[PDB]
Amino acid sequence: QNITEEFYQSTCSAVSKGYLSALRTGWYTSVITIELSNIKEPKCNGTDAKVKLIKQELDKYKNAVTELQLLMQLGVGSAIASGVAVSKVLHLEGEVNKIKSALLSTNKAVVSLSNGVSVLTSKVLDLKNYIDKQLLPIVNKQSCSIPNIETVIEFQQKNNRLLEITREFSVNAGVTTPVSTYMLTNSELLSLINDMPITNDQKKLMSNNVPIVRQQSYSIMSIIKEEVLAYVVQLPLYGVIDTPCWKLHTSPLCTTNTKEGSNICLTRTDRGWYCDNAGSVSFFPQAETCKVQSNRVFCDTMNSLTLPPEVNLCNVDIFNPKYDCKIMTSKTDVSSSVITSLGAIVSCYGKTKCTASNKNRGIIKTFSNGCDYVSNKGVDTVSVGNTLYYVNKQEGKSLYVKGEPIINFYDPLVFPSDEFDASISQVNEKINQSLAFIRKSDELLSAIG
Amino acid sequence: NITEEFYQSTCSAVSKGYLSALRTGWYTSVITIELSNIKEPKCNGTDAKVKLIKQELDKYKNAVTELQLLMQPLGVGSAIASGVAVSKVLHLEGEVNKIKSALLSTNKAVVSLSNGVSVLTSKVLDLKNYIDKQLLPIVNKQSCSIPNIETVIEFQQKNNRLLEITREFSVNAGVTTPVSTYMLTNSELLSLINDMPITNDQKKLMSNNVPIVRQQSYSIMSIIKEEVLAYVVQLPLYGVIDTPCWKLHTSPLCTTNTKEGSNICLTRTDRGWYCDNAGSVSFFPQAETCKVQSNRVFCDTMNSLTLPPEVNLCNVDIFNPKYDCKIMTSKTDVSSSVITSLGAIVSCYGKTKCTASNKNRGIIKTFSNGCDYVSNKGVDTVSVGNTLYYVNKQEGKSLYVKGEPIINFYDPLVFPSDEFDASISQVNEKINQSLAFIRKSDELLSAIG
Amino acid sequence: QNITEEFYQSTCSAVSKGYLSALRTGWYTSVITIELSNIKEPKCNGTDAKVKLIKQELDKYKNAVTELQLLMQFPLGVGSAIASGVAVSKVLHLEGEVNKIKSALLSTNKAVVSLSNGVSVLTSKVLDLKNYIDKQLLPIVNKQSCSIPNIETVIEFQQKNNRLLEITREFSVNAGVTTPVSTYMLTNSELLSLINDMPITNDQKKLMSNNVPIVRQQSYSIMSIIKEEVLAYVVQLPLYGVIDTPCWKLHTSPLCTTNTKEGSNICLTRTDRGWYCDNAGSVSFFPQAETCKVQSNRVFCDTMNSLTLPPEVNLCNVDIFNPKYDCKIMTSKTDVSSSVITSLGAIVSCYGKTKCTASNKNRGIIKTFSNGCDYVSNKGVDTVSVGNTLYYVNKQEGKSLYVKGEPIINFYDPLVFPSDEFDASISQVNEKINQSLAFIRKSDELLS
Amino acid sequence: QNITEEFYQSTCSAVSKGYLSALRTGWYTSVITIELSNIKEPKCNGTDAKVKLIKQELDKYKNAVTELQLLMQSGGGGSGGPPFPLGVGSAIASGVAVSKVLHLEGEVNKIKSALLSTNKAVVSLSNGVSVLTSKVLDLKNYIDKQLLPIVNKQSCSIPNIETVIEFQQKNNRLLEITREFSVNAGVTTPVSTYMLTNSELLSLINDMPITNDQKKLMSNNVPIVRQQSYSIMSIIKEEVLAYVVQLPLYGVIDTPCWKLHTSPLCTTNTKEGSNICLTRTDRGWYCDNAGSVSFFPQAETCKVQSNRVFCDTMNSLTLPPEVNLCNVDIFNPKYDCKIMTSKTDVSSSVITSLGAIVSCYGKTKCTASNKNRGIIKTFSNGCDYVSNKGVDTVSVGNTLYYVNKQEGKSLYVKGEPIINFYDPLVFPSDEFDASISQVNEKINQSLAFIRKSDELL
């Protein structure tokens, strides 16, 4: 493999490349079912120790049932419209029954619902069969033939799943992310992925990264009726796979020459993850949304902006004519560090002491005032002020790109020092507007001399 | 049962499993309408029913008048030359009389005409009977009996077919295709199919695909003389049937190696329908010259090429030695899509958006730059740029043939880049030529010592 | 509306601007039904003339029903237009669906119905031959003794049956899919009622309602099923997702040199002629002339017959040598006189001894053309005459402008000009010229 | 359940009306106790398998108790546990106050006596605060009776498998309670069924001193109540474990609410940087509240059921009702509508209660489509609105959004986008926060400077 990183001394930024995309574009929903002997209710004259335990469990099971019935009843959207769509179909009368019939002969079917959706169906727990067979004869009459100890233990363990489904939805109000292991066993998810109408490339991918698939899935609680508990599991579908990705890291760029509170600072405002997606670039500004396993980036495109491919030119030539590169400005000469994919960017301003260091021989570099970068080869920690940032130790090849820090090119009298969201062109229009005051208030003075 | 293979090497796909029905020849039959001779009313009465009956007389008379005017890499065919031959004989002296002689006592007979043209003939409407027995009796006398009201209504209905046949001929120079229920009702068309020198399975074939027969038939106005209207119907004769047909779709195949249009492009040009036929392959290159009902394929051999069965090897290995697969080359860096029988070929080039999507799930593939394929297995639409295509949803078995796109074997500087219809060998002729020059004139530059 | 045209003297091509888009991007399907009576040929042993006329029409109805039962069983791309409406057709083929629509319509003639593959469609009962036959016609003729029918019953049944036969006739020669959707398939009032009931914006309703003929052209009628005494056929209507974006039309004509020795000229023709409409930040390009239909200043096109181009395609009109987009051209040596009549003008390519003329209906010849590519507005011009061909100029009113400049065929050296290129570009010709220059200069340094 | 929505073209913003308030206005706190055994660690020699299992389960019980002691001393749960103009609260401030009273003298004993013949009582504390008090678990009774004569003696008597099993289950709730606390420094949200079973919480809701309408609202929306409730570890002493539970109190109910969605409003009149932008910034939830309008600007301090909006006023501002006049005329006289300006030409879509807002700028593929019909509108540059009338998705670039398919009626209010009235040569585009009037000033300043400057030249 190859993950590489370039550091642009001119812009105090770093682009780390070599990653492969896997972006969520679509959803697949499936219906999961637990089938309950709700009909059950215990009464009998027997009072063995082993009887009490089964009666206690029946109250637990019967409680979870009654509670579950009460519980039944930036770019903005709703993530779970697909699952809620299947949930509302399930409430149509007999739609639940279609599932029961299909799941009579095996525990995994493909039922086509009334809205023309063909969805995987799984029975994952058969509590009606266990109770009605091994339990109901025990506690229906009064002579209440006492069970063996293994039935006390077995019913208790089967009932455990149902109890922690109900615990989950007493605090989640029906919708969880990630979908939990009681919601769906890892073994069941693996069998679901194996049965999904997708490429064999996708199936291998979803199986390799089940933990990621969990975090990007939704459990949506649907119905309890006709002795069936049904909930929808909504899984990610990655339409984009193996396009190039790259991550942008950005730190402030300031003037060190002035030795006061008055200095101009400029920063690339467009950091985050980047992906090629259908002839454009999908950009994820909250890099908190993109999970990375190995060199693969798993993002949900619902959290992206779509940008023209020319945005990549702000990493080559920040002053290019083709893309209006976005920057911010401030007058805060504050030192900080940004740990990158296999390196570290340091901005060191003021009287702060900035260290690069190695766990075998202590301090191995002192930083000048200004913006600098070090590779993760021969550096373990980077210290800025009272902060010790450890550095990522993933293997890869780093590169230092030398250039004049572009903050030097700006003339501090006329610099718009407090631009929150501006660009390279927005800043020059502000500069030239300020020189407009300069020529006009000057040659007005040249009327009397 | 329809199957499909997509060859990724050559950006093409074959749809197998269809059954031939090829137009081998023609069957020409003569259709007669018996007409009373024009007798202008010569009657004075002014009841509204006489006015109405006279009005319909002039529609009839001005229709006989209109028909009197009317009577007086591929090959290049003459479609109705078969039917016109029969029409030409009827124009002869004493031939229309032969039709009358054989049709006094039947509504159908086989008549010998002078040129050895012995053709079946049918009398389909007898207006001379109706006019001379019921109508002009009242209206040809100097003072006219004023008619039945039901005679007014019935005469209009009887005359309707004669008027409509005249209209169809009058706006079509006398030749009509498809053949309508006015030239030939479905009752008579089925009757004629019962009496052709075809095998019974061919009689069944036509009698079930009657719309197809009509589309491929002609109706040639021939003569109006001797109280007789006659026109020639030309019905297709399907002499080769139930033999295997496969359809070849092809799409452009280009390198994406460089950006900014430095690419070379290659496209198979043999796209169309192929059918086994008497030890050869009939090739129909204009997929409109074929119709498809169910898994059947009605093609017209007149628009066909006869190819040796070795042409099929181009689908197996495009660099086979026996057949020289027709290819074209250009630099067309545009995106396109072909809907196959149970899939879609996508040739996504440049920076276009190309996706396959499912109606309930959303985007499920996002194609990379190059030639790919999706099957209708869980795919409902393909979108290329702004164009949205719908895939066929028939039940089928589609196989992806992995291989290397042969546009990469070719060097981008030896490539004859604008050849309309060359072959693999004709290009390798020009690669061999353009190569041989450079090595010589570069080795000629060696001996400057 | 304001229409403008510019003639680019440098590329022998004019661009008409100012049209307004209506690009069909999706389909809507409706199920149109005719409720039938399906009663057998009658046992009434009767002879009166009004009985005979009724029997003739009944066997017309029977034959039409049986005729319908037997019905069932270049840089561009390729699709199936009716694939959307064939979805709904085969939903109907499943038992249960026909009963659904029958229940929804036995009390009212218009409905919204949810078919079981997940589609909600408007459905209409347009003709009810069941209850007419069963209550006016079946009574008197299902008995061996026939009551003689009324005459106005004979006239009316023949009128009602007429639509069923006409729809049968249309389906019978068109394999069961028809375009345009006739007035027998859907009368004008029924269409405007559908348009009202569509879940479309209140603007698209105005567009379709005021362009009913064009909606007919880009629509389909799909014969679907007969059973349960119900005839149903699916009607598929255009949905113009793109509306009122700017559109423009590009006209092109061969641009050649004029120097005189027959067989010693190089030619060069822009090849991107067709319709262009702005569409979702790109340019949809309709290179087939037939596909786009122009009514008023509006251009109706089917997006499935289009190629999507980067917006920089438009720069080919202001600068064919532009850095960004490689403009598509073809070359040759075969130069003939020919004219292209534009939206509000005419391009004349006059070459050789051919005489070329523009003339007014009163002033006679108002222009005589020089050899080479030229233009003339439709202002005070009625006909253009190139050789023995007389073209008429369009008399649409609009403003036009003559962008003067040097024909680019002049810049090219005839002795290296690639004169065979069929589908080439400005840059492809540039590559081939630089190549042929090098070969000649290669042999020059390899003569020394 | 008549949800309706209007879209204002002039300001690029839609309002959903017809929701019902359920506002959290205050807190109810109740004390919950678990009786504990002061059992010393097993004192006997025993090696039977079942003696081992009971010994282990006692250690889990004993360890969990010293763990809970570690919480109640180091800290004790007593903690201090926002956008542009908002305030800053202290959620557990109410509950911790009751937690500290329990550390006083005899307040533990008042409860212990008050919960002797019952397991639910009312205690009036040493400060006059009357709190419901519930004993949920009695481990002292079980450990001392069924469990102590085994461990007490010099040689352990072997227990049953049933005693081994039943103790594992009685012990369980105490351990899970200790787990939750040990991982949260003794303050937990939401309140779990371990902290408080649905049986206990619905019984607790009934006994509370609140209206009948409040009881109905709370007893139905149990998960929302759990999400909005805190559980504060308080004290372990006196052989009693007691923790405070802080429940939301809905003092405002059934008043009308509405939600405002906004999007950028950018001039399309030019190419690339020449465009200038306006955007309303008062988006969020509004509810009529005591003749004022409570504004919830983070719409996710609110949770939404059918028709019903559960907001928390700690994240609210209080506004005069004239604020709604911003949704009929952004240039109104009474209230100064707050906006923001920029030069940011990137497309964006908002999903509303029953519609979609699309801000298509530059060259994005902005599109709204249907499951079975395909694209039913391609947006052109500007700010447009589509309802969910047979609309299932909206695509902006590569991003697919699903429209709300809520059943309701939608109104498109036509108007001139106000961004077209502003002179782009003298327009201010820095404003993180500004009002309509504040922008008119900065334009009055600039245009009146050129009044004087035109004079002198």
From Swiss-Prot, chain C:
Family classification: Belongs to the paramyxoviruses fusion glycoprotein family.
Keywords from the UniProt entry: Cleavage on pair of basic residues, Coiled coil, Disulfide bond, Fusion of virus membrane with host cell membrane, Fusion of virus membrane with host membrane, Glycoprotein, Host cell membrane, Host Golgi apparatus, Host membrane, Host-virus interaction, Lipoprotein, Membrane, Palmitate, Signal, Syncytium formation induced by viral infection, Transmembrane, Transmembrane helix, Viral attachment to host cell, Viral attachment to host entry receptor, Viral envelope protein, Viral penetration into host cytoplasm, Virion, Virus entry into host cell
Superkingdom of the organism of origin: Viruses
Extracellular compartment residues: 1-447
Cysteine pairs bridged by disulfides in the record: 12-373, 44-146, 247-277, 256-267, 292-301, 316-327, 350-356
The species this protein was found in: Human respiratory syncytial virus
Annotated GO biological process: entry receptor-mediated virion attachment to host cell; fusion of virus membrane with host plasma membrane; symbiont entry into host cell; symbiont-mediated induction of syncytium formation
Gene: F
Region annotation (Fusion peptide) ranges: 74-91
Keyword Lipoprotein appears in the UniProt entry: yes
Coiled-coil ranges per UniProt: 51-71, 92-143, 415-447
Pfam families: Fusion_gly
Carbohydrate-modified residues: 2, 45, 434
Gene Ontology cellular component annotations, sorted alphabetically: host cell Golgi membrane; host cell plasma membrane; membrane; viral envelope; virion membrane
Name of the protein in its database record: Fusion glycoprotein F0
Gene3D superfamilies with a match to the protein in the record: 1.10.287.2480, 6.10.250.1160, 6.20.370.50
